[PDB]
Write a protein that binds this DNA or RNA. Structure first.
Ligand SMILES: [Zn+2]
Ligand SMILES: [Zn+2]
Lengths: 67, 117, 121, 134, 74, 50
RNA sequence: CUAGUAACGGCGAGUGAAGCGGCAACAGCUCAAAUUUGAAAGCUGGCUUCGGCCCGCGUUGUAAUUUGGAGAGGAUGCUUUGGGCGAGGCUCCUUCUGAGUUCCCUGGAACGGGACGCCACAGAGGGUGAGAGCCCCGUAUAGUUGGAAGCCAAGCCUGUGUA
RNA sequence: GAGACCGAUAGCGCACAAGUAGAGUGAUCGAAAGAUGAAAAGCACUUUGAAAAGAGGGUUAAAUAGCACGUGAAAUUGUUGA
RNA sequence: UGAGCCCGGGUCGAACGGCCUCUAGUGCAGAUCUUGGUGGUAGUAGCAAAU
RNA sequence: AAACUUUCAACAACGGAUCUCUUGGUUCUGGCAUCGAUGAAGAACGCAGCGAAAUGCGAUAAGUAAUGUGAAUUGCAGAAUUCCGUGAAUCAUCGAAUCUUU
């Protein structure tokens, strides 16, 4: 149901979506590897996902999500 | 069909749920007044008049005097113990008599009559 | 000048009349002399007017109580001593008259009253 | 949330009832909390304020000022504390209107009816304490 | 003048020759009232005046149209 | 997935599980939901008129 | 709902029901036409010491009995009752009932921001010097204080007359 | 008791003196008009002069919030500069 | 491209905005349009009803 | 040259739009049934220290009595009027009264 949740997110409503008038949409989700709303970068509509985030200590981690 | 002044005679029904609440509270008031009694009276089974509805039956107005006498319920006691009486209806056949007599003895089998004092 | 109400309730008719007379005379004199240099006379005039109102109320109440004591067993009372209600409430049937029934109805209700019963499920 | 059908959550009706209230209702509205020591002593949280109470102002530009209430102006919904005053242009010292919700009563003007009020409030609070305990 | 003062409505609409008020019809017992003028009916309706007695009826209804005095009254 | 774990009052699982109903495998149709919600949100409306 | 059907109409404009069926609510009765005729047994007033006394109405008919899916009269043998107090209860007004004005900053004013808490069957609403659950009024829930009028009522007194 | 209503040219004619002021012989017709500030603390006093007016000075967080009072558009107008 | 939108500077003093849907009393240059305000004519004609 | 006319900017006017507000309207829903010859609805005249409006009241006249609450009213002026009290109040309730001319 990756495709169905993608259709619901992309075509109806997503709380992490920033719609700009300049030709690009942005993803407000913290686990998005690129802050852009597209099919490949969605942390929710992709069951297997991976991102890179930096802690307040300065240590950088890789986050992996499985189905 | 708007030839007449229909503007002055439009009836809306925004008070439908409020009237349903009013009807339910009226039934509750009837229950409060008649506390162990049912809020309804017992009514007979009658056949629908026309040939179109002859196959089905419905509830009548009140039991015939012959039906009450055959069931063993006196005429004057019957309205005071929850049974409706209709003096206009006639039986005309041995099959409505038996059905409503069975209904009356079934009502008698499940009745808790209290003494006067 | 200022008189409380219960003290007036204790006294009788001729007494209440003589305080009424002296209060009226004081009010008349103060109204005559109040046209020049009205200082603290205004509050006293207002208090005296309220005092006359209180005395008149007490005498009226005592007189109407005595009149009601007179008419305790008499059939007709004066219209001032009758309850007002409304015009329609004064014209409706009395409780004794409206609750009256015929003898046939009374016999039927006596021997065949509405009974208490319960249909068990 | 209100449940009783007689209560109204209308802002319009509430504002009209507040600003067009009688003098006794205004007395009830113009109430002040008791001090900590008086709250443990009488088991009463707040009382309607009256002339002769000694209060401390806990809000506004006149914070931490104490004094005796010399006027309860119900029409203007304000009390006048002693020595918490102002100066006009001419130099007259006018009182400063302080809301009774901004003060804390440190000393009550104890009469018989005030003791009856305190007793009734204490009885209700202790009977609810009994209901909570068991 | 054509019209003089009327006793019933207090307006200067009583015809000086016919002796009949043009606003209320004073010699007639019934006050003049017509359904083709709602404005005229609302200028003299029950509620546009002082209500000396009709304003006291609801409070008397609220307590059941009772008589007497409370117990312990003086 | 056939079962869903049950959690205690402390937030930790009790060890018991429940069978997931069929209604969680129903089709997810945002168009039907949009239609019925648009209709149903209008049903508590009080009339207004001049 | 029947039903824009039947029916009617410069048969054009059109006008336009009802029975049945489903439901809401249900409740039945009073007289006139009889002779009480072994007893006007009925009623409005006035006087009252309030208990019973007078005048009048009325026989050209006031009570009782009866009202046609009825009824009366006899016989018959079973089955039914009437009044007066009344504790208390319901309805409605009323009294009372939770918790921060803790510390810092900004600001004329904190009801704003930060920190640490508390109440919640109460985070409806309003006021308070700016967005206040805990400053105030109220709000929620069961109670509780006093009162008003109706109705119901456990019980307690009595019943009576060949009714 | 409420609302997916209207918000002072709107919503009742009337949020305020509203069936009022006012018009008509009369039957009748029928307006316009809300907002200082948290609090009047509503400008003391000195000084021009006859003003519903100024200059100092004061209150206020603020007076370019001064009962012509929240904000203060445009049409239109005056002073200065180009 | 455009209807428009975003930011700076000043004034101001209590609320407001984007996005996805829903809803409508939803967009003005004109109607001898309605209401209010304000002009040239014009400090002109004239001292006329009102003022 | 000066004067006049036009455009632009700053400031000051005129005017009251815009924004924000709202003890108002409007529409819906629920409980209840209560005017008058025992004088109604309506009209008029009066009552307060300063009352112009509005409201309240009727020669007992911004009101009297009774009950309840419990310390005010308030724009200014006045009270030797009341604060462990049958008791303030432009208070609330309200069963007793007064209630001018129509
Ligand atoms: Zn996305
Ligand atoms: Zn007239």
């Amino acid at each position: 149901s990756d495709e169905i949740v993608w259709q619901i997110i992309n075509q109806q409503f997503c709380a992490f979506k920033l719609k700009t008038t300049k030709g690009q949409n942005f993803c407000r989700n913290e686990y998005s590897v690129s802050g852009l709303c597209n099919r490949q970068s969605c942390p929710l509509a992709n069951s297997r996902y991976a991102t890179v985030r930096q802690s307040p200590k300065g240590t950088i981690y890789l986050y992996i999500k499985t189905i | 069909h708007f030839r007449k002044h229909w503007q002055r005679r439009v009836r809306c029904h925004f008070d439908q749920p409020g009237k349903k609440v009013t009807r339910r509270l009226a039934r509750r008031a009837k229950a409060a007044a008649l506390a162990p009694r049912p809020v309804d009276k017992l009514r007979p089974i009658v056949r629908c008049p026309t040939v179109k509805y002859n196959r089905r039956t419905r509830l009548g107005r009140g039991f015939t005097l012959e039906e009450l006498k055959a069931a063993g319920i006196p005429r004057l006691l019957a309205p005071t113990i929850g049974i409706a009486v209709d003096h206009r209806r006639k039986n005309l056949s041995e099959e409505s008599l038996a059905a409503n007599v069975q209904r009356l003895k079934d009502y008698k089998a499940r009745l808790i009559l209290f003494p006067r004092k | 000048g200022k008189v409380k109400a219960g003290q007036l309730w204790s006294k009788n008719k001729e007494e209440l009349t003589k305080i009424l007379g002296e209060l009226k005379t004081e009010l008349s004199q103060l109204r005559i002399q109040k046209i020049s240099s009205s200082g603290a006379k205004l509050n006293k005039i207002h208090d005296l007017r309220k005092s006359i109102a209180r005395v008149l109320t007490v005498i009226n109440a005592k007189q109407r109580a005595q009149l009601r004591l007179f008419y305790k067993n008499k059939k007709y009372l004066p219209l001032d001593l009758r309850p007002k209600l409304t015009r329609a409430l004064r014209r409706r049937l009395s409780k004794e008259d409206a609750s009256r029934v015929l003898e046939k109805t009374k016999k039927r209700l006596t021997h065949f009253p509405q009974r208490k019963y319960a249909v068990k499920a | 949330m209100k449940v009783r059908p007689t209560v109204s959550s209308s802002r319009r009706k509430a504002r009209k009832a507040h600003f067009s209230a009688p003098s006794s209702v205004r007395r009830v509205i113009m109430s002040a909390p008791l001090s900590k020591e008086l709250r443990e002593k009488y088991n009463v949280r707040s009382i309607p304020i009256r002339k002769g109470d000694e209060v401390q102002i806990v809000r506004g530009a006149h914070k931490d000022k104490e004094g005796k209430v010399t006027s309860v102006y119900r029409l203007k919904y304000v009390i006048h504390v002693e020595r918490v005053t102002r100066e006009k242009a001419t130099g007259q010292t006018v009182p400063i209107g302080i809301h009774p919700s901004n003060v804390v009563i440190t000393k009550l003007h104890l009469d018989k009816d005030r003791e009856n009020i305190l007793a009734r409030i204490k009885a209700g609070r202790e009977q609810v304490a009994k209901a909570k305990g068991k | 003048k054509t019209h003089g003062l009327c006793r019933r409505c207090g307006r200067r609409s009583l015809h000086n020759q016919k002796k009949v008020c043009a606003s209320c019809g004073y010699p007639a017992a019934k006050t003049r009232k017509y359904n083709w003028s709602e404005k005229a009916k609302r200028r003299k309706v029950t509620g546009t005046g002082r209500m000396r007695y009709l304003s006291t009826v609801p409070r008397r209804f609220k307590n059941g149209f009772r008589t007497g005095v409370p117990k312990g009254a003086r | 997935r056939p079962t869903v774990t049950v959690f205690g009052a402390d937030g930790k699982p009790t060890g018991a599980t429940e069978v997931l109903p069929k209604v969680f495998s129903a089709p997810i149709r945002p168009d039907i939901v949009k239609h019925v919600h648009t209709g149903m949100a209008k049903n508590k409306r009080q009339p207004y008129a001049v």
